[PDB]
Amino acid sequence: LFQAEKDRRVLQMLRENLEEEAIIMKDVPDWKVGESVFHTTRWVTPMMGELYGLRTNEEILSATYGFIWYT
Amino acid sequence: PFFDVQKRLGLDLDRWMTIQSAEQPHKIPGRCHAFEKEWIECAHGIGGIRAEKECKIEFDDFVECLLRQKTMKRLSAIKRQRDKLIKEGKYTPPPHHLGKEDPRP
Amino acid sequence: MNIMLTLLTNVTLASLLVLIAFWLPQLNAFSMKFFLVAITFLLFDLEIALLLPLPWASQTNNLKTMLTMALFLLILLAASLAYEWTQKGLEWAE
Amino acid sequence: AGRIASFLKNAWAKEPVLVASFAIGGLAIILPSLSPYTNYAIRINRATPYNYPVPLRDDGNMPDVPSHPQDPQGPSLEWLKNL
Amino acid sequence: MFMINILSLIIPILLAVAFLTLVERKVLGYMQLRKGPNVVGPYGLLQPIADALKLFTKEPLRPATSSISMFIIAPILALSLALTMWVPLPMPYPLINMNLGVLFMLAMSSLAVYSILWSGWASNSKYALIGALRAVAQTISYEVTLAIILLSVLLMNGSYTLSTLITTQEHIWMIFTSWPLAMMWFISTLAETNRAPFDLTEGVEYAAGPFAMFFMAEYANIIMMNAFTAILFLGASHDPHTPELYTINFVLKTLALTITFLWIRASYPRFRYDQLMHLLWKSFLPLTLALCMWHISLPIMTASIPPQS
Amino acid sequence: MPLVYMNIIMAFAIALAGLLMYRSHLMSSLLCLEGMMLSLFIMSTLIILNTHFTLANMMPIILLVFAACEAALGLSLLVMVSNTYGTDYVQNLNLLQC
Amino acid sequence: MWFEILPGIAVMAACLFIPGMATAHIHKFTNGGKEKRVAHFSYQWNLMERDRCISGVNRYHVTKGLENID
Amino acid sequence: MNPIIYTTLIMTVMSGTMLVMISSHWLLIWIGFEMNLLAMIPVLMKNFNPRATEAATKYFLTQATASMMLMMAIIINLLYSGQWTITKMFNPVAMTMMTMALAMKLGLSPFHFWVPEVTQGISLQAGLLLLTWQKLAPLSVLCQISQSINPNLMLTMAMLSILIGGWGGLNQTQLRKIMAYSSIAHMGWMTAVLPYNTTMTILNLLIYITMTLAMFMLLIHSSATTTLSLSHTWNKMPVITSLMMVTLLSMGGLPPLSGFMPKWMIIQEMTKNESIIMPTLMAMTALLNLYFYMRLAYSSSLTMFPSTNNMKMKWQFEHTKQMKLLPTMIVLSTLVLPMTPALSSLN
Amino acid sequence: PGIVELPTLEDLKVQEVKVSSSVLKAAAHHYGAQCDKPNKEFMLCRWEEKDPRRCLEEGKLVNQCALDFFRQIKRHCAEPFTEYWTCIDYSGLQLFRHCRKQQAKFDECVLDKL
Amino acid sequence: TMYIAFILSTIFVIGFVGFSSKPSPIYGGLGLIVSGGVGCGIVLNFGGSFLGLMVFLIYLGGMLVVFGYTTAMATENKTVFGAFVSGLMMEFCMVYYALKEEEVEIIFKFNGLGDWVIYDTGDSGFFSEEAMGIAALYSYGTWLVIVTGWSLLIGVVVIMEITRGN
Ligand SMILES: CCCCCCCCCCCCCCCCCC(=O)OC[C@H](COP(=O)([O-])OCC[N+](C)(C)C)OC(=O)CCCCCCCCCCCCCCCCC
Ligand SMILES: CCCCCCCCCCCCCCCCCC(=O)OC[C@H](COP(=O)([O-])OCC[N+](C)(C)C)OC(=O)CCCCCCCCCCCCCCCCC
Ligand SMILES: CCCCCCCCCCCCCCCCC[C@@H](O)O[C@H](CO[C@H](O)CCCCCCCCCCCCCCC)COP(=O)(O)OCC[N+](C)(C)C
Numbered sequence A: 001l002f003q004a005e006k007d008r009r010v011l012q013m014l015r016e017n018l019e020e021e022a023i024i025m026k027d028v029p030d031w032k033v034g035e036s037v038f039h040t041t042r043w044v045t046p047m048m049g050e051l052y053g054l055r056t057n058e059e060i061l062s063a064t065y066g067f068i069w070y071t
Numbered sequence B: 001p002f003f004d005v006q007k008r009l010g011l012d013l014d015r016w017m018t019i020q021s022a023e024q025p026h027k028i029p030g031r032c033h034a035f036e037k038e039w040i041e042c043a044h045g046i047g048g049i050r051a052e053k054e055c056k057i058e059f060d061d062f063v064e065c066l067l068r069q070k071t072m073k074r075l076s077a078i079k080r081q082r083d084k085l086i087k088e089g090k091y092t093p094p095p096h097h098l099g100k101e102d103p104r105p
Numbered sequence C: 001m002n003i004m005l006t007l008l009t010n011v012t013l014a015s016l017l018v019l020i021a022f023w024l025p026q027l028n029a030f031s032m033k034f035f036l037v038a039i040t041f042l043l044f045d046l047e048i049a050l051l052l053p054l055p056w057a058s059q060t061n062n063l064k065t066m067l068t069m070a071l072f073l074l075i076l077l078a079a080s081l082a083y084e085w086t087q088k089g090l091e092w093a094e
Numbered sequence D: 001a002g003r004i005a006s007f008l009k010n011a012w013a014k015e016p017v018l019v020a021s022f023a024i025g026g027l028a029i030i031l032p033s034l035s036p037y038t039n040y041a042i043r044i045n046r047a048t049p050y051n052y053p054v055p056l057r058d059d060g061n062m063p064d065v066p067s068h069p070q071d072p073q074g075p076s077l078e079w080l081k082n083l
Numbered sequence E: 001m002f003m004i005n006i007l008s009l010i011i012p013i014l015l016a017v018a019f020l021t022l023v024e025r026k027v028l029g030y031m032q033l034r035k036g037p038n039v040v041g042p043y044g045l046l047q048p049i050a051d052a053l054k055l056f057t058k059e060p061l062r063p064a065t066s067s068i069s070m071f072i073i074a075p076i077l078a079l080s081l082a083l084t085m086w087v088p089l090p091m092p093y094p095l096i097n098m099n100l101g102v103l104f105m106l107a108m109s110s111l112a113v114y115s116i117l118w119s120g121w122a123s124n125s126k127y128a129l130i131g132a133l134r135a136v137a138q139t140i141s142y143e144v145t146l147a148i149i150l151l152s153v154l155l156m157n158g159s160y161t162l163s164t165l166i167t168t169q170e171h172i173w174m175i176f177t178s179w180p181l182a183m184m185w186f187i188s189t190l191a192e193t194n195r196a197p198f199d200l201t202e203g204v205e206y207a208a209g210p211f212a213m214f215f216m217a218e219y220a221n222i223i224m225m226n227a228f229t230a231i232l233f234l235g236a237s238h239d240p241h242t243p244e245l246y247t248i249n250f251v252l253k254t255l256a257l258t259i260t261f262l263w264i265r266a267s268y269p270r271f272r273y274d275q276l277m278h279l280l281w282k283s284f285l286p287l288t289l290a291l292c293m294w295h296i297s298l299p300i301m302t303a304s305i306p307p308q309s
Numbered sequence F: 001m002p003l004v005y006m007n008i009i010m011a012f013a014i015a016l017a018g019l020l021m022y023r024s025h026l027m028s029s030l031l032c033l034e035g036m037m038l039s040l041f042i043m044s045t046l047i048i049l050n051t052h053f054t055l056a057n058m059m060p061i062i063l064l065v066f067a068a069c070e071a072a073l074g075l076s077l078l079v080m081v082s083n084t085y086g087t088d089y090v091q092n093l094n095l096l097q098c
Numbered sequence G: 001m002w003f004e005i006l007p008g009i010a011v012m013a014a015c016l017f018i019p020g021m022a023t024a025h026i027h028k029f030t031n032g033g034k035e036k037r038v039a040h041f042s043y044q045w046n047l048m049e050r051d052r053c054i055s056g057v058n059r060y061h062v063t064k065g066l067e068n069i070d
Numbered sequence H: 001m002n003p004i005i006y007t008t009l010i011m012t013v014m015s016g017t018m019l020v021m022i023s024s025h026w027l028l029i030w031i032g033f034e035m036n037l038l039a040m041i042p043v044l045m046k047n048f049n050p051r052a053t054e055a056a057t058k059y060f061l062t063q064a065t066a067s068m069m070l071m072m073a074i075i076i077n078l079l080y081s082g083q084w085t086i087t088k089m090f091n092p093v094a095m096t097m098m099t100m101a102l103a104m105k106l107g108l109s110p111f112h113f114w115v116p117e118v119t120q121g122i123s124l125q126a127g128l129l130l131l132t133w134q135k136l137a138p139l140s141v142l143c144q145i146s147q148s149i150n151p152n153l154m155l156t157m158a159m160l161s162i163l164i165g166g167w168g169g170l171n172q173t174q175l176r177k178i179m180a181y182s183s184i185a186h187m188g189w190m191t192a193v194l195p196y197n198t199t200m201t202i203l204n205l206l207i208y209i210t211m212t213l214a215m216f217m218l219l220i221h222s223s224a225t226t227t228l229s230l231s232h233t234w235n236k237m238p239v240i241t242s243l244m245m246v247t248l249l250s251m252g253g254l255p256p257l258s259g260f261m262p263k264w265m266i267i268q269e270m271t272k273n274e275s276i277i278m279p280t281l282m283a284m285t286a287l288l289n290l291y292f293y294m295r296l297a298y299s300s301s302l303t304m305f306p307s308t309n310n311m312k313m314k315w316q317f318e319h320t321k322q323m324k325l326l327p328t329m330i331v332l333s334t335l336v337l338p339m340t341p342a343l344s345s346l347n
Numbered sequence I: 001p002g003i004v005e006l007p008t009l010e011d012l013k014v015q016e017v018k019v020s021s022s023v024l025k026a027a028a029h030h031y032g033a034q035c036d037k038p039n040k041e042f043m044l045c046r047w048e049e050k051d052p053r054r055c056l057e058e059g060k061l062v063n064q065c066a067l068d069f070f071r072q073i074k075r076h077c078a079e080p081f082t083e084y085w086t087c088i089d090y091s092g093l094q095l096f097r098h099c100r101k102q103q104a105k106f107d108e109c110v111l112d113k114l
Numbered sequence J: 001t002m003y004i005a006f007i008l009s010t011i012f013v014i015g016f017v018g019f020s021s022k023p024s025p026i027y028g029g030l031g032l033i034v035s036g037g038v039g040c041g042i043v044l045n046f047g048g049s050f051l052g053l054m055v056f057l058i059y060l061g062g063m064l065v066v067f068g069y070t071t072a073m074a075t076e077n078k079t080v081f082g083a084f085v086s087g088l089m090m091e092f093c094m095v096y097y098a099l100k101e102e103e104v105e106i107i108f109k110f111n112g113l114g115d116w117v118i119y120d121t122g123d124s125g126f127f128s129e130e131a132m133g134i135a136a137l138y139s140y141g142t143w144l145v146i147v148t149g150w151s152l153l154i155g156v157v158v159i160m161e162i163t164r165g166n
């Protein structure tokens, strides 16, 4: 169950980030939306920055240091 | 220079630790296991010169997975554009990026 | 964060107490034998560092190999101690 | 055996700490090899599930692979239960 | 609330240090057939306060030829590291629950060694420097022995977690399991804390307020060592719904161990420096290595390896 | 590569420069030598933890052990030189000439 | 007599009682009358984060169940 | 030093070098280097004196700095490639750091001063072992990583080594310093041929090792450490002086001796790759080495320097210790030119 | 190079199993025994495809099976299960050792009913 | 974010600058202790708990204690301040360059966006990957244990022989 929930959450966050990127980068001369940086079409595990780049600092800090700082 | 005693005697002194796609304890995968495996399978058995000349796509994918230079550049460009837009006030963040949203289980 | 706050509180309280005690009345107006002990301690501390990851190493499926390696490290440590003992590195004669 | 007996007698009267340490070390080295429970310990370590038991695609030629966790096929921890 | 918890951990420790000074004086007196302080307060319950007030309102004697930076840092470091080693101790719940708590204790002690060296080098006096060097040698040797013993003990625990230590000792006592290690651990803790028969340093330059800082740090270290020994070898039963029983039992065991420290100091004469140095490297270290080998081999040969989680 | 790696490499370079520029004492040279190993340990552990190289986690421990053994050897040589000459000054090491 | 040592030992015991009892009381107070969750591993931390998310009041200790699903 | 401890340390040095030469892991190679240095220091400090202590201290400082640089290069290579296997390094900066560290270990210029300093500080056996083994190992590492070596930097260091060795040997008078500068020049030749043919590198290594062993063992036999001390050997055992003279002639590259074969093969290999100026300059610069070889040979073999009076007692007594493989090393260092095509076997 | 394909938010919506970790852990062995088939299908899909986007339907089926399992539990043994997961929730480590009585009552309830 | 790791790295570099300026052996040792503590903080913040505690314990308790002990038993300028100022200026210039934009004019190319960005979303379960990898020194790593133990024994013999004298 947790694997399915994690996959769904990751996909939803990626879609939200893609929509926001499309909204923001609508005036750049040459900027494809959702363009990958890999030559392969294989699925690549999203980076932490790719998911929490455009979110709040509290959420970023929680996601990056929550387990390390919890004692 | 290189007396390959390990290959001659069938030993495993350090070939287990040579690469990160080998057998790991508890089957813990590496960060770039797939990219390294693809690069190794491309470059195996063709020699160093041909490996450098031909498996450039695989090597570039491996290096991109390792260092994340291009991904970081893209994210920084997006962040810079967003900051410039919100400085003028033309662009406003959505509620979920603003901080008013329900997370997912 | 919690550990950092605890350390900061401890250091701050210690400094405050030391400064209060310091200014409350102030209102106005080579030995070779000793050196070898340090080197032996450093080497045995390195051996201890090697021996530290033992509790987790007992959970592996190669119990025989793990036991052999741990006993080998301990035997080498004992051999170093015995060599120093026989060569009189532990003597405090003068 | 007279010489070794005399040596042991003198060591037990002069360096009892060294005699005890050497005896403990010798027992520590020898006993695990001549023990029946080492295999039990190895099996217990191997029986502990850390990773997820990824299932296999059924091909019709897996008689020893259970189709359900409660099926009689597959490894059983009855020995560990009675231990 | 976390700051409240930190203060509740800190201030009672200092109060316990002061009343431990009082209790030590009274116990030594009664063992020596005297009475001990029973005049300053009712049954002498004002002597720590009087001593603290006098030491605070006493004139200091900071040397002109001294490094002020080290002269100030050394007592601060000593007191901070004395107070820091109480945050991972469970009683029954640690203030800071760490996955690797034992290694934190070892690192804190190893850093606490620095205070003696810095204090000796701050006075710019040759003789105090020599005394500090001898103290450093003794402390580092017994640190090696303590580290090996603590490694040996935790092989029956499965991890470096003191909560897991409590869970392991739920049934029986690690002192029943490994009493020779308990003997050597107790003696090595005595030598590390520099109590008799190992008080070679006291058998000087600091005075008035800064001296009280070192005294409090040393007594806090003694109490912490006794509490750690009680947790490690005299594990009490923990009930999740009534944690106060475990706290009472743990405090009683810690008091018993500290009283035993005072008892030993009263009873025994003093070792010589070379005699206590030969005591470790030629009597404790070989036995410690042999018992470490035995405790490595025992879980494997008996199929009793503790769980990692 | 992020800026943390840049700072670690800069620290290693500074420690290396300090070793190559003696002032009076040989002890300071050993201290600068030990700083380089600290920077190397930090860089190695950051790289290994970032890439989840599980089997490589034992490399920093081996590096630390060997470098501490080298430090002990250097301290032994330094105390021998100090016993011979009276001070740990590098100026006394001039009997041999090129 | 020897029982005159007890008041000092009593004060020491009272002082040493405070840390553990205070820690337990604070842990039960800041977690809704329950023991503080021990997140020694990433699995436990993920469980805590999921509990906080499903609670929605940004408190992991606010537990929900059958009355919440249906 | 106890004989058992001495042989244990020698075997530890050899085992470290063997680990370096057989390991396919950078961590294991670094471990081998560390073990080699650790076991080598007491060999230098065997005969205890302030000069030996100073030489050992300088050697330790140099080797520790080189090891730190090598480990930094390994880490940098790991950062950009994530590979531990010793192959063509994937980062130019890491390759440059590795090349500089290995040059410092070998003694190539401008990292050469410690070579004469330590060689003068330590005794003859220590100098022999130092030169031979401590140049055997890093050359193996360089041969393994040859395909990524920067030719410009490698050839610059090689030519600097040749020139510095020639001039230092010209000015020096001490036999051990002369041997150190000779070693520097020969290492320069080897590293010059390295980026083109590791087989030629190995051939030069073998010939240089044979000649150095012969020369050092002759010096030990004659118990001479200076020019004037060697000038008295003709009055006690003139055979040794003649053997030393022919060995010195061979080390200078004079045909038809064995020393001409490495220079000849290196010149051929370098001129195959359309490189003429470098072989020409390298060949012309060896004349300085031959000059100080000939100057040393004048004082010992071709002339008769004045002797002393106790040399009569020296005549009365006889040498006791026998050198191992001395005649074989003398023959192999002067009469193996007609066996040159064995470099195919060496390949 | 190329455009990453991502499913739209409409097909990423499904009724989540909104229960706490204590509730999930209380009904863990029974959940694994009863909803074994969809869970194993989803895990095999994930380990073969190596792509989250290729096994969304299996995840939805897993969620549906979990919801059905919890509804079946609530219809019959709501109170014994409530006591069991209340007992489990108190412990910081959520151990099964301290609730051997509530677990026994819950197992007796589910065995008799379902 | 708060650039906590970046601040720790800057403090690490500043301590290195001080201890390489070397006002005195004791002050350099103290600066090296501070820098070691900062590096332990860096690795602990990254997530290497066992390796950070190992560096703390070994380095500070054993390695820098014997350095001070040797220095303390010996007891035997504008250049230091100038070097310290130059190092601080260089570090501040590099930090400003990196924060303003990608400082690629150095021999390496650095992009500054976040050590949380450079992380990964993966996670283990009911075990520590670092702890398991380090404990693999006995199951795997048999050769490493043998060579390290032999090196340590030879180092004991070496320090015994060198300090003998004669
Ligand atoms: C005078 C000498 C001074 C030497 C040191 C000077 C520099 C001090 C630098 C401090 C760095 C702090 C690092 C930790 C930052 C937070 C990281 C974190 O959250 O870690 C979680 C970890 C959690 O522990 P864990 O290992 O159980 O983590 C696993 C469990 N999870 C993942 C669930 C958390 O915390 C620790 O490891 C605690 C130990 C920290 C050790 C470093 C600090 C030592 C402080 C004492 C020495 C200095 C005393 C100075 C006194 C005054 C002198 C004048
Ligand atoms: C100065 C002379 C000292 C003489 C010896 C004093 C200690 C006696 C024990 C043997 C010698 C010391 C050995 C090392 C320490 C051993 C610790 C030990 O076993 O301790 C035993 C007990 C605690 O053990 P316990 O039996 O309670 O714990 C049971 C543990 N489980 C459940 C795991 C089996 O502690 C003491 O007796 C404390 C002694 C020191 C304090 C003296 C003042 C208090 C006197 C008793 C007060 C009783 C009421 C307290 C309040 C109750 C409220 C409900
Ligand atoms: C084969 C011919 C060798 C000739 C030369 C021999 C002497 C060379 C120098 C010493 C080399 C030692 C060999 C080390 C190779 C290690 C690999 C091999 O030994 O396998 C190990 C097997 O472990 C064994 O217990 C041997 C451990 C090493 C031997 C005991 C210690 C010997 C130390 C020798 C040097 C001591 C130096 C100091 C002397 C005083 C590791 O087990 P591993 O495959 O991975 O995983 C478990 C799988 N099992 C269960 C099937 C084994």
Ligand SMILES: CCCCCCCCCCCCCCCCC[C@@H](O)O[C@H](CO[C@H](O)CCCCCCCCCCCCCCC)COP(=O)(O)OCC[N+](C)(C)C
Pocket (backbone or CB within 6 Å): E015, E018, E041, E042, E045, E048, E049, E052, G011
């Ligand atoms: C947790 C820490 C607790 C620390 C204290 C624990 C034990 C406390 C025991 C106190 C028992 C009461 C002591 C009373 C002593 C006599 C009081 C009186 O005699 O002194 C007066 C002045 O003394 C003070 O006012 C009383 C102080 C009592 C103690 C206060 C609490 C102790 C301070 C706690 C500080 C804790 C921090 C320090 C830790 C080291 C002067 O009165 P006087 O001039 O003759 O008047 C004439 C006498 N007549 C009336 C009968 C005719």
Ligand SMILES: CCCCCCCC/C=C/CCCCCCCC(=O)OC[C@H](COP(=O)(O)OCCN)OC(=O)CCCCCCC/C=C/CCCCCCCC
Pocket (backbone or CB within 6 Å): C075, C078, C079, C081, C082, C085, C086, D008, D011, D012, D014, D015, D018, D019, D021, D022, D023, D024, D025, D026, E286, E287, E289, E290
């Ligand atoms: C009745 C016993 C029943 C059990 C018997 C089982 C077998 C026991 C076998 C015991 C072996 C005998 C060892 C005792 C002899 C030790 C040598 C001795 O007698 O002492 C000499 C001398 C001490 O005399 P000093 O006080 O220093 O100088 C005196 C100056 N006038 O000892 C030495 O020289 C050192 C020799 C041993 C070094 C010990 C160093 C640490 C080694 C112990 C670690 C144990 C590891 C276990 C590994 C065992 C397998 C190898």
Ligand SMILES: CCCCCCCC/C=C/CCCCCCCC(=O)OC[C@H](COP(=O)(O)OCCN)OC(=O)CCCCCCC/C=C/CCCCCCCC
Pocket (backbone or CB within 6 Å): C028, C029, E059, E061, E062, E063, E064
């Ligand atoms: C058997 C071991 C004993 C030998 C070693 C002991 C060393 C002690 C050396 C004695 C010399 C005294 C100076 C050393 C300690 C300095 C203490 C100090 O600075 O106190 C300052 C403080 C000043 O007054 P305040 O309290 O600040 O203001 C309020 C005034 N009522 O206290 C004082 O009154 C002291 C002022 C005068 C004392 C100094 C006079 C003697 C100085 C001569 C130089 C001797 C230096 C000793 C050299 C030691 C090596 C040979």
Ligand SMILES: CC(C)NC(=N)NC(=N)Nc1ccc(Cl)cc1
Pocket (backbone or CB within 6 Å): E014, E017, E018, E021, E025, E047, E048, E049, E051, E052, E055, E212, E215, E216
């Ligand atoms: C060992 C002797 C000198 N000590 C004592 N009898 N009492 C003691 N040093 N005085 C003291 C009392 C309380 C406090 Cl918080 C600090 C110092």
